[PDB]
Amino acid sequence: WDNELSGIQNTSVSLAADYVYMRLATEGFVFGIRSSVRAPIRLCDAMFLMCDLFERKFHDRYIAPLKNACLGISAKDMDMRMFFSALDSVFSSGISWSRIVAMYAFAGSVALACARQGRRQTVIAIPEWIMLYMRRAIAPWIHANGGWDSFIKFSQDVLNGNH
Ligand SMILES: [Cl-]
Ligand SMILES: [Cl-]
Ligand SMILES: [Cl-]
């Protein structure tokens, strides 16, 4: 059954795969998992560029809280439970497009840390971590706040206003 929530979920995990492998490539880890861009191109562009902007210009507001939640966990021990707990530590106070960008950016950070430790099977699972995490609260929030199209408009506004 194709319904709007399952559609949002399919888009979220396609996007998570694109973003994780793109982020890895920016540091020279070229996994070659994908044959093509999996999410819609405009959305893939939007998430990659928003994550980059947040890493460069909004790191301590959006990304540091997730990293700090994981302080003292080695890359060898990073797992989906850690990932969920860190995300919970922010989303417990609310959901926003900026916090969703932070979740994807942080998944990239975790992927990079695992790739540097050679934990290949963990890296390739991180897109599923995002998909599974979003089922309980993020996915219905996205549905109620305009779908991924609303993220595109948000991203266009933010990216057009930063230079
Ligand atoms: Cl529907
Ligand atoms: Cl790839
Ligand atoms: Cl809200």
Author numbering: 6 to 168
Provide the authors' original text about this structure.
BCL-2 proteins are defined by the presence of four regions of sequence homology, the BCL-2 homology domains (BH1–BH4). Based on the C. elegans prototype, nematode BCL-2 proteins inhibit apoptosis by sequestering the apoptosome scaffold protein, CED-4, on mitochondria.
Helices α3–α4, which line the BH3 binding-groove, are essentially parallel, similar to the apo-BCL-XL structure, though closer together, particularly towards the top of the groove, resulting in a “closed” conformation, as seen in several other BCL-2 structures. The end of α3 is noticeably disordered relative to other apo-BCL-2 structures. The unstructured loop connecting α1–α2, which is significantly shorter in T. suis BCL-2 (and CED-9) compared with BCL-XL and BCL-2, was well-defined and packs primarily against α1, although with some contacts with the beginning of α6. Helix α1 is well-resolved throughout its entire length and its very N-terminal portion is in close proximity to α7, a feature not evident for other BCL-2 protein structures. Helix α8 is also extended relative to that of BCL-XL and is visible through essentially all of the juxta-transmembrane region, which is usually not seen in most BCL-2 structures. As this loop is thought to be critical for CED-4 dissociation, this structure indicates that the regulation of apoptosis in T. suis is potentially distinct from C. elegans. Curiously, the loop following helix α4 in CED-9 which is required for release from CED-4 is absent from BCL-2 proteins representing clade I nematodes, as is the case in mammalian BCL-2 proteins which do not directly engage APAF-1.
